[PDB]
Amino acid sequence: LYEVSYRRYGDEELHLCVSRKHFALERGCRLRGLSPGNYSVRIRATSLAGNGSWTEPTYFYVTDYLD
Ligand SMILES: *[C@@H]1O[C@H](CO[C@@H]2O[C@@H](C)[C@@H](O)[C@@H](O)[C@@H]2O)[C@@H](O)[C@H](O)[C@H]1NC(C)=O
Numbered sequence: 139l140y141e142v143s144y145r146r147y148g149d150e151e152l153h154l155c156v157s158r159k160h161f162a163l164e165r166g167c168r169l170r171g172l173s174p175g176n177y178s179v180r181i182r183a184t185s186l187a188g189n190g191s192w193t194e195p196t197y198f199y200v201t202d203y204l205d
Contacts, residue, residue, distance in 0.1 A: 141182045142167050143192070146175040174202040 140161060142154040156167045167181075176199045180192040 139184050140167075141184070142169075143180045143182070144169065144177050146173070146177045172200050174200050 139158070140156040142156060143151055144154070145151045154167060154169070156164070161167070176197055178195045178197055180195055182192045183190050
């Protein structure tokens with residue numbers, strides 16, 4: 139599996155578990171219907187041995203369709 143830890147600046151952390159089947163199907167992850175803003179993502183692969191280091195933060199901006 140993988141864990142996706144996203145957070146829109148100021149808010150609290152949101153999460154998502156992406157399983158193998160889920161990952162191979164979706165070609166990664168897909169985040170559906172987030173309120174607008176600049177989000178910060180870290181990703182962490184969990185293998186048979188343990189939880190391996192979080193990917194440095196990436197930023198993604200969901201459009202405001204107003205402002
Ligand atoms: C999204 O946010 C990135 C990181 O923001 C940085 O840290 C915060 C706490 C503020 O100090 C901010 O001014 C810093 O830039 C930005 O570097 C990035 O450009 C932003 N992304 C978009 C799409 O606007």
